[PDB]
Design a protein around this nucleic acid. Structure first.
Ligand code: DUP
Ligand code: MG
Ligand code: MN
Ligand code: NA
Ligand code: NA
Ligand code: NA
Ligand code: NA
Length: 323
DNA sequence: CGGCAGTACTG
DNA sequence: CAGTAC
DNA sequence: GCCG
């Protein structure tokens, strides 16, 4: 819808990789706004008006129109590309990237031979290219089906659904986010051990990034899988097992988008409520720092519509939550 | 002034 | 806990 | 970065 965002996106990523998360959040919102406006902004007024664009941001959008080039883009630290390169390794965030840079590292060859890697980062580096590729949704289906078949094998009751970008109807998916639960509200307990060992038996899972299997309270699995046959690449696979009672909130959460959940959760807070992947709460007590000090009551939410409804919002289809 | 979402692993 | 990621 |  607009081409002034492609210029801001560069700045947003620069602040993000440098650790200035709040400023980056400000640019991210300004960009999600613009991309949502049909009539390309033209006047300073037409800028400030939009929510997520203030003086500072409006001034920048202008330069992109009267000059066709944002000046600041020429004053971005030469460290950014390397910081981005490093933070694109799964398991390494801004802190790790900055430390490696300070240590003199400038390439993945440097990381491979000189940096000490956590177990997750070593896996992330091994699949550096794979993890940056998005798969066609058709492949995401086969993966969701492979997990669903392995799960229903020892319990046909298990309800399995692919969420995230998949459920939002995108053509390509960065990974496959599978939600698993059960209508009886109890048979979901202690299944990770079984499901994972099953997927491991047929050679589907190749690496584990996060999987607390010694804990019978395991809620999530983040790992790597690869379908059988030639021409297959390793793909990221996320799985969460939730009790039916939290099905609507888990589904809403896992479906996203991320910026969508944040906005929805921010809204609930303004209403003295609290929204999480576990439930929607009301009468929540908090302090001046927006920090929760009181639990509050869990509200009944058997469906996603219920969540929207309780928050006083019209229901949005998954594809309409792609923020 | 100061929050900006709420939560689950890892070591 | 800080860091990281969903 | 934005906004209450
Ligand atoms: O910061 C986050 C990240 C994810 N989420 C939720 C929403 C998101 O859609 C879901 C799965 O996260 P992914 O990282 O898998 N993203 P998504 O599936 O939307 O896109 P992609 O195709 O990149 O995987 O978890 C959050 O609430 N906060
Ligand atoms: Mg995803
Ligand atoms: Mn995911
Ligand atoms: Na505005
Ligand atoms: Na990253
Ligand atoms: Na990373
Ligand atoms: Na583990």
């Amino acid at each position: 819808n607009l081409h002034i965002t492609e210029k801001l996106e560069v700045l947003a990523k620069a602040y993000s990789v440098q650790g200035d998360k709040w400023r980056a959040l400000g640019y991210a919102k300004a960009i999600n706004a613009l991309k949502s406006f049909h009539k390309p902004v033209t006047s300073y007024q037409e800028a400030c008006s939009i929510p997520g664009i203030g003086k500072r941001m409006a001034e920048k959008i202008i330069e992109i129109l009267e000059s066709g080039h944002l000046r600041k883009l020429d004053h971005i630290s030469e460290s950014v590309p390397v910081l981005e390169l490093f933070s694109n390794i799964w398991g390494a965030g801004t802190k790790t990237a900055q430390m490696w840079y300070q240590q003199g590292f400038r390439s993945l060859e440097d990381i491979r031979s000189q940096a000490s890697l956590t177990t997750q980062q070593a896996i992330g580096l091994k699949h550096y290219s794979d993890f940056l590729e998005r798969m066609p949704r058709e492949e995401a289906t086969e993966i969701e089906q492979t997990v669903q078949k392995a799960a229903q094998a020892f319990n046909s009751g298990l309800l399995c659904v692919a969420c995230g970008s998949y459920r939002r109807g995108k053509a390509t998916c960065g990974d496959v986010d599978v939600l698993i639960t059960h209508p009886d509200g109890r048979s979901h307990r202690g299944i990770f051990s079984r499901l994972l060992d099953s997927l491991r038996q047929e050679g589907f899972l190749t690496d584990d990034l996060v999987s607390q299997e010694e804990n019978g309270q395991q809620q999530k699995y983040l790992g790597v899988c690869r379908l059988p046959g030639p021409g297959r690449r390793h793909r990221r696979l996320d799985i969460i097992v939730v009790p039916y009672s939290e099905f609507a909130c888990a589904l809403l959460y896992f479906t996203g988008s991320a910026h969508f959940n944040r906005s929805m959760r921010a809204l609930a807070k303004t209403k003295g409520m609290s929204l999480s992947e576990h439930a929607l709460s009301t009468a929540v007590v908090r302090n001046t720092h927006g920090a929760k000090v009181g639990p509050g009551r869990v509200l009944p939410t058997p469906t996603e519509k219920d969540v929207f409804r309780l928050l006083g919002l019209p229901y949005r289809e998954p594809a309409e939550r792609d923020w």
